[PDB]
């Protein structure tokens, strides 16, 4: 019940989703962004995912309270910072994504890597997950997915991904 969240994350109207660690299906969450409280349903999925409704462009502080039966049971110790993109920045991000998709057709890694470079860590995570789902053996790039999970503080996912990486190292002829 030591929930942590990303220290810094970029979101935008095109990529509005925030993610944090699922503390257990018994728990709901209250996501607080600059004093506005959002009631987040409990989930049994691999992570908690919440579409942030439109914020004003710029920096916003957020924290998360863990709740059980509507009662606070835990809380982020340090919050994080959301940077919400302006209309102009979001148009550029959207054009960059389009450029990368045109130039590297079907390449989910290239897409994830571009989004990652702009701080759009949840969208980078989605693209990377697609990449590794179809190129499970691309171990050299896997640390970027590991780092993404680590940045979002998705502890279990990070541990699992690290185990995949190690098992793939260990599969090398002669290694173990």
Numbering used by the authors: 136 to 311
What do the authors say?
Magnetotactic bacteria (MTB) are a heterogeneous group of aquatic microorganisms that share the ability to orient themselves along geomagnetic field lines. Previously in the alphaproteobacterium Magnetospirillum gryphiswaldense, the MtxA protein (MGR_0208), which is in or attached to the magnetosome membrane, was identified by a comparative genomic study as “MTB-specific. Because of its co-localization with putative signal transduction proteins within the same operon, mtxA was suggested to play a role in magnetotaxis. The MtxA protein probably has an importance in periplasmic or extracellular interactions that could act as a sensor or mediating interaction with other proteins or even activating signals in the bacteria.
The proteolysis with trypsin yielded a smaller and stable domain that generated crystals of excellent quality, which diffracted to 2 Å resolution. Furthermore, the residues seen in the electron density maps are L136-S311 (L142-Q313, MtxAΔ1−141). The overall structure of MtxAΔ1−141 has two distinguished domain architectures: I- Ig-like fold (MtxA-Big) in orange, and II- TPR fold (MtxA-TPR) in green. The first domain—MtxA-Big: L142-L226 (MtxA142−226)—has a common Ig-like fold consisting of seven β-strands forming two antiparallel β-sheets, which pack against each other forming a β-sandwich. The second domain, MtxA-TPR S227-N313 (MtxA227−313), contains five anti-parallel α-helices-and-turn motifs folded as tetra-trico-peptide repeat (TPR) motifs. MtxA-Big and MtxA-TPR contact each other extensively in a parallel orientation with a buried surface of 558 Å2. The MtxAΔ1−141 structure displays two protein monomers in the asymmetric unit. The two monomers tightly contact each other with a buried surface area of 418 Å2. The hydrophobic patch that covers the whole face created by the TPR and the Ig-like domains may indicate for an interface for interacting with other proteins, since TPR and Ig-like folds are known to be part of protein-protein interactions.
